[PDB]
Design a protein around this ligand. Structure first.
Ligand SMILES: O=P(O)(O)OC[C@@H](O)[C@@H](O)[C@H](O)CO
Ligand SMILES: O=P(O)(O)OC[C@@H](O)[C@@H](O)[C@H](O)CO
Ligand SMILES: O=P(O)(O)OC[C@@H](O)[C@@H](O)[C@H](O)CO
Ligand SMILES: O=P(O)(O)OC[C@@H](O)[C@@H](O)[C@H](O)CO
Ligand SMILES: [Zn+2]
Ligand SMILES: [Zn+2]
Ligand SMILES: [Zn+2]
Ligand SMILES: [Zn+2]
Lengths: 263, 255, 263, 255
C-alpha cells in the first residue's frame, strides 16, 4: 500500500513560509512516487502553554494560505480543528481533518469532522492507552468517516516527558491506519516553562523504529530554519534534512516489510 | 471558608437534581463553616463510547440548575466544552468548570474568564503541577478573579491515575486548590474504597476545598457509576474532613 | 495499637553521631509513651549510585555502634542487610531486619532474615505494585517470620522521580503492618547525577497524608546537620524538627483514627 | 560483530540445554557474521512466588553450562545474585550477567569485574538511561574491560514495562548496548506478539546485540513461559534482524 508522509511547518507563520515548504515537498513527491504526500500546517495553535505564545493569523487566512499551496503545487492538505464549527470551512480545503491529541475524546469535534466526508486523522491523546482508540474509531465510523487514521505521538511518562510505546502501532492497526508523529513524540511537554522542550537528536532513530515495527505513514513538522520557528522550534526538522530522512525510512520499510505481522 | 462542591455527575433529570439538592441544602444548614456549591454536567461531551449517556442538552440543563439555585438558594457550577457555551451557562453558574482534557484550550479559558464568573480548571491528567501556573495566567489575562485548580489525578501507566499530593502545595502558589475525590480514583477507560482514604489525605495535606460526585443510587447512575458517592454517606465524610482539617490546619505550610 | 516510629541517621557515619541521635530519640520515647521507637542506621550503603560515594565503616563496626545505642539508651534497633550471610550477625543486635527496596524480591535474603526469629521490614520496591507485596509476605511467612512490615517508599514515576500512591497503604494492610517512609519518598533517584536528589519541603505534608489515610508507623531519617550528611543530605530531617513532626502525626492520627477502614 | 545471546531462561536440565545448544550451534555455523553466546540461569533467585521453580543449584548449573561449552564450543553467560558466586561462575561464563534489580549492588558489580570476565548489566526497571553511566564506572573501577548494558524495559505504571528506545543511543555513549527482546514485553507480576516487532525496532535504532530466551516448548517452560521464543522461530528472527541491520546501519548516529 502507498506510504503516507504528512509534513509541513508546524504553524502557518505566513503564506510565504508555506509556499517555500510546499515547493520542496512538491519536489520530493515527484521523486518519491511511491509516497503519498500531504502538506500540513495549523491555522491556529489553540493550546499553547503560554498566553504570550504565537497562535496564528486566524482561520480565514490559514485556509486561504493552504488553498494556495494546494492550488500552486497540487498537494493534498491537512490541518487541525479545535471546535466543531471549524470542520465545515476547513473541509473546503483539507483532504484530511486532524484532531488534536488533547481533544481525541471530544465527541462533537470528532462527529463534526466525520460528516464532512473528508478523511480524519486523530492524534492519540497522551493520556490514552492504545486499546482505547478502538472507541475513538467507532465514534468516527458512527459519524460517517470512511478513511480514518490514528497518530502515535507519545504517552505521558512522569512529568514533562513522553515515551513512545511501539506496541501501540500493531494494536491500533487493528482498527485503523496508523501514522507515527516523528516530531511531537520527542517534545518535552512544558519543559521550558512558558513553552515545551524537545530533543531533536532522537527524531531520526525513533522514526527508524516506527517503520521497522510497521506503520502506514509518518508525520513530520519541517521548517526552513527551525531555530526561528514561532512554535516547536526545538522539534521541527530542518527542511534540508527531509529528503534524506524519507529515503531512509523507505529503505528500512522495504527491508522490514516482509516481516510485518498480519493484523 | 472551606469549599465543598458536590452533586450528581450528570443531569439525568431535574428531578434527580432536586433530590440531591435537598440533601445538599440540609448539609448547607448544618455546616455553616462550609461554602457548598451544587455541581452537575448538562453534557458528558467526552465519554469513551458513542453509545454512552451524554445528557439532555444545555438548555434543559441550565433550566434544571436554575431550579436548584432558586428552590434551595445554592451556588452553582457546571462544565463547558466549547467557547460559545460560556455566556449562556454563566447565567446560572457561579463557577464555570473547565474539563481536564480541555485545561489547555486557550479560547475556552478566555470565554470562561470573560463572563466575569469564577473559574475552576480541572488539571489535565497530562499536566505537571508547575505547568498550571500558565493556566492561571491565561485566566487572569482574560479577566478572571476567582480562580481554582482541581487535582484529579495524573496518568500513571495505562488506565490508571495516581494522585501526587505534592501538587496541592505547588498549585497553591498561584490559585486556590480543590481536590476531586471521586475522579482521582477512576480507572480511565475506579475503586470507591479509596475515595474516603484519599480525601482524608487531601485535607491532612491542605487544600481549599473538595469536589465529590454524589448520587442517591450510584449503582444506577448513567455516568461514573463505579465512583459516585452514595448520598447518605456525604454527611459523614464532610464531618470527617472538617475534623481532620481543624487539627491539621495548624501545620499547613505558608504560601 | 502502638504506633511505630523508626528513625535515625541514614548511615553510621560514626558511633558518635549515633549516640547523639540516640540521645534525642531516647528523650522523645520518654515523652511519647504511646509510641514504640526503633533506632535506625545502615552499617553500609551498598547501592549508592556512584562508586565514589560514602558506604560505611563495615558490618563489624556498625553492629558494635548499634549495640552501644541499644545498651546505652535501651532502644530497639533496626538496620538493613544486603546479602544472606549478614542476617545472622545482624540479628544479634537488630530487633527488626530491614530489606532494601531493590532487594525485596531476592528470595534468599528474605529467607535469611526470616529464620533469625527477628521481625522483618521490607521496603517496597519502586518497581512493585502494592498488590504484589502479598507474595513478599508469603515468602517471609514461609521462612518463619512472625512479625512483618511493608514500607511504602514511593514508586517509579518517569525518570528520576518517585510518586507516592497512597492507595498502597490500605492495600498492603491486607497482608502486613504498613510503614510510611517519609524521607525516601521525596528523593529524586539519581537526580544530581553522581547522587540522588530530594525535596525536603514535601516531607511533612506527605507524612500528614500518610497518617490521615492510616498506617502502623512512620520511617524518618534524621541527622543533627543534614547538610553535612554523607548520604541523603537532601532528604534527612533536621534532628531538632523531629519532636514537632511526631507530635503532629500523633494528633492527626488520633482525629483521623475513627475513620480508618477495617481491612 | 553483532552479538546474539540466546538460550533457555532457566537450566531446567542439562538435557534441555543440550537440545537448545545444538540449534544455537547450527545457527552459529550458519551466521558467521554473528557472535553467539549461550545463556541460561542456574537459579531464578527473584521469582514472585516462593512456590515457583528456582533451579537445581549453582554446581549442577555450572556443570551443564560446561557441557554446552565443551560439546558445542559456544561462549557462555549466566547471571549471579550474590558476590560469592562470581568466582565459581567465572570458571565457565565468558560473560557474567547482573540481574536488573541488582544493577546497583556495588559489591556484586565489583565481584563480577574482579573475575576478569566480560560483564553484562541488565538496566533496572527503575533506572534512567543516563543513570547507567555510574554503573559502567563502577565496573571500570573494578577492572572490567568488556562492559555491556542491556535494555529490558522501564516501569510504566503497575505490572507493565515500556521500552524507551531513546535509551539505546544514550547508553551507547559509555558501553555496548544489548536489547533484551523477551523480558522487555513481560508484564511484571507478557505478550509474545510484540517480541519480533520490538526487536526490529531495536536494530533499526541501533544496538550491538540482542538477547532472546528460547525454549523448544515455551508452553512447558518452568520460567517465563509466556515470553520465551519457540526454538524453531529463532533462525527466522535472526535472519530478519541481520537484514534490517544491514540496511539501517547506514544511518546509525556516531557516538
Ligand atoms: O510550546 P508549547 O506552547 O507548549 O506548545 C506545544 C506545541 O509543541 C504544540 O505543537 C503541541 O503539540 C500542541 O498541543
Ligand atoms: O469513559 P467514560 O466511562 O465514558 O467516562 C466518562 C468519565 O471519565 C467522565 O464522566 C468524567 O467526569 C470526564 O472525563
Ligand atoms: O545518593 P545515592 O547515591 O543515589 O543513594 C541513594 C540513597 O538515597 C539511599 O539511601 C537509597 O534509598 C538506597 O537505595
Ligand atoms: O514473576 P515471575 O513469574 O516469578 O517472573 C520471574 C521473571 O521475571 C524472571 O525469570 C526474570 O528473568 C527475572 O526477573
Ligand atoms: Zn507542532
Ligand atoms: Zn463525573
Ligand atoms: Zn537513607
Ligand atoms: Zn528469563
Amino acid at each position: 500500500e502507498k506510504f503516507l508522509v504528512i509534513a509541513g511547518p508546524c504553524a502557518i507563520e505566513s503564506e510565504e513560509l508555506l509556499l517555500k515548504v510546499g515547493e520542496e515537498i512538491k519536489r520530493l513527491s515527484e521523486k518519491f512516487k511511491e509516497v503519498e504526500f500531504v502538506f500540513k500546517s495549523s491555522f491556529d495553535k489553540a493550546n499553547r502553554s503560554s498566553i504570550h505564545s504565537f497562535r496564528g493569523h486566524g482561520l480565514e487566512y490559514g485556509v486561504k494560505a493552504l488553498r494556495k499551496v494546494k492550488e500552486e503545487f497540487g498537494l493534498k492538505i491537512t490541518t487541525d480543528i479545535h471546535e466543531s464549527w471549524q470542520a465545515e470551512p476547513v473541509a473546503e480545503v483539507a483532504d484530511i481533518i486532524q484532531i488534536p491529541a488533547f481533544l481525541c475524546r471530544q465527541t462533537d469535534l470528532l462527529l463534526a469532522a466525520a460528516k464532512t466526508g473528508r478523511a480524519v486523522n486523530v492524534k492519540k491523546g497522551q493520556f490514552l492507552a492504545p486499546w482505547d482508540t478502538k472507541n475513538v474509531v467507532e465514534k468516527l465510523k458512527f459519524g460517517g468517516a470512511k478513511e480514518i487514521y490514528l497518530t502515535e505521538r507519545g504517552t505521558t511518562f512522569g512529568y514533562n516527558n513522553l515515551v513512545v510505546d511501539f506496541r501501540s502501532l500493531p494494536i491500533m492497526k487493528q482498527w485503523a491506519k496508523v501514522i507515527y508523529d516523528a516530531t511531537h513524540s520527542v517534545q518535552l511537554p512544558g519543559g521550558l516553562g512558558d513553552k515545551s522542550g524537545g530533543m531533536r537528536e532522537f527524531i531520526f532513530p525513533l522514526i527508524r523504529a516506527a517503520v521497522a515495527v510497521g506503520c502506514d505513514g509518518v508525520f513530520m513538522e519541517t521548517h526552513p530554519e527551525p531555530e526561528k520557528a514561532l512554535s516547536d522550534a526545538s522539534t521541527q526538522l530542518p527542511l534540508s534534512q527531509l529528503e534524506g530522512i524519507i529515503e531512509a525510512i523507505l529503505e528500512i520499510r522495504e527491508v522490514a516489510s516482509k516481516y510485518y505481522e498480519t493484523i
